[PDB]
Amino acid sequence: ILPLIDLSTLYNLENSAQAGLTPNVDFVVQYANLYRYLSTIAVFDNGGSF
Amino acid sequence: ALINPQFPYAGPVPIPGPAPTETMPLLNYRVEGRIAGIQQARQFMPFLQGPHRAVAEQTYHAIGTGIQMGQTFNQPLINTQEG
């Protein structure tokens, strides 16, 4: 007796790096569509300064 | 809702609205999903299916043996009363 949807679904964590930030301008990171995003973490590595 | 004359509530949100996007589309998902690993018929457990005894009864085996043997001492004879 097995939950077929549960076992054929992937629950994953992945990370990536995005560049191209400029002062006072909206930096937009598009969600890579089709995935159901449960959480998002954004780390602002400001040239080695946090 | 209350409408108050002469300041009436606009009769609509009108045609000056700013259509902001055409991103309205949900792209249908197309996929093939296969969960096919070899299955082996068995699982190991500590115990399944047992209805363990909480107390047992007392249980036993049996034996007898011997013969019929005896050393005897008898009452003395007595005068008979009547009859």
B33 interfaces chain A, CB cutoff of 8 Å: yes
Stated resolution in angstroms: 4.2
Q: Searching chain A, which residue's CA lies closest to the CA of residue B25?
A: A33
Q: What's the gap in Å between the CA of A34 and the closest CA on chain B?
A: 7
Three-state SS annotation for B20-58: CCCCCCCCCCCCCCCCCCCCCCCCCCCCCCCCCCCCCCC
Half-sphere exposure of B8 (CA within 13 A, CB side): 5
Cα separation, A13 vs A38, in Å, equals 10
- How far apart are alpha carbons A44 and A30 in whole angstroms? 16
Q: CA–CA separation, A31 vs A14, rounded Å?
A: 12
